[PDB]
From a paper:
Instead, individual domains and domain combinations were investigated structurally and for possible interdomain interactions. Xyl exemplifies a “beads-on-a-string” protein where the individual domains are “beads” each connected by a linker (string), with each domain retaining its individual function- making the synthesis of novel super enzymes for rapid and efficient degradation of bio-waste to biofuels within reach.
Xyl-CE4 at a concentration of 10 mg/mL in 20 mM Tris pH 7.5, 10 mM NaCl was crystallised in 8% (w/v) PEG 4000. The Xyl-CE4 domain encompasses 201 amino acid residues folded into eight α-helices, four β-strands and several extended loops that together create a distorted (α/β)-fold in which the β-strands form a curved inner β-sheet surrounded by the α-helices. A single metal binding site identified in the crystal structure of Xyl-CE4 was correspondingly interpreted as Co2+ without further corroboration. EDTA treatment reduced enzyme activity to 0% of the untreated sample (0.2 μg Xyl-CE4 in 50 mM Tris pH 8.0). Addition of 10 mM Co2+, Mg2+ and Cu2+ restored the enzyme activity to 133, 122 and 110% of the original activity, respectively. Zn2+, the optimal ion for most CE4 enzymes, decreased the activity of Xyl-CE4 emphasizing the importance of identifying the optimal metal ions for each metalloenzyme. Catalytic activity of Xyl-CE4 between 20 and 80°C indicated a temperature optimum of 45°C. CD spectra recorded between 20 and 80°C yielded a melting temperature of 56°C.
Residue numbers in the entry: 583 to 787
Write the structure that this text describes.
Amino acid sequence: NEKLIALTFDDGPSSTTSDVLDILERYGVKATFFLIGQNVNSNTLSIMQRQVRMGCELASHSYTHQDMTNMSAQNIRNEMEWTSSAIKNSVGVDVKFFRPPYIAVNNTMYQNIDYPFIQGTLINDSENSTSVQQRVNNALGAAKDGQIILLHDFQGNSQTVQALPQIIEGLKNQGYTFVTVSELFEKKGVNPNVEYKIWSNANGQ
Ligand SMILES: [Co+2]
């Protein structure tokens, strides 16, 4: 009767990431970080190393974080390969999932990206006008068994850092167990590797 939640973070690594990690470590919780490839560099190495130490999953958010519906097939493929190899060659882990920038997806992307697409429920934590407590309530209201929840850890997103302790404490209080996206599919016995699909819940609905 385990109830699984996959907390996920877009747009890092950034210095804000380290504050997210401090909180995840405090609560013994793992998350998934969809990284922007050009943010994988010597300035972010120690953060990515700590992500791997804590068993947080690293995934792909493209290399330049542009709207990939305006990109050629070749450029899409280069973005994906460069992001995966940057993550593999820096800290030794293999990307398993892709999340499209801006959740902008078209046929060309689906034809030229070999990873499962992840969306999840947005909590609108990219705009400062969304308060700490709005972020808390949106995350708590989006939770259900098997659900992926989309947050951001771009530099400066301190209102999500402020929101995260209530979110974790509240979901545990509701009986949820935190998993990575890989762990989510593994534990539900679901094959994520379905082409032409974008997932928000391990049930695929
Ligand atoms: Co993004």
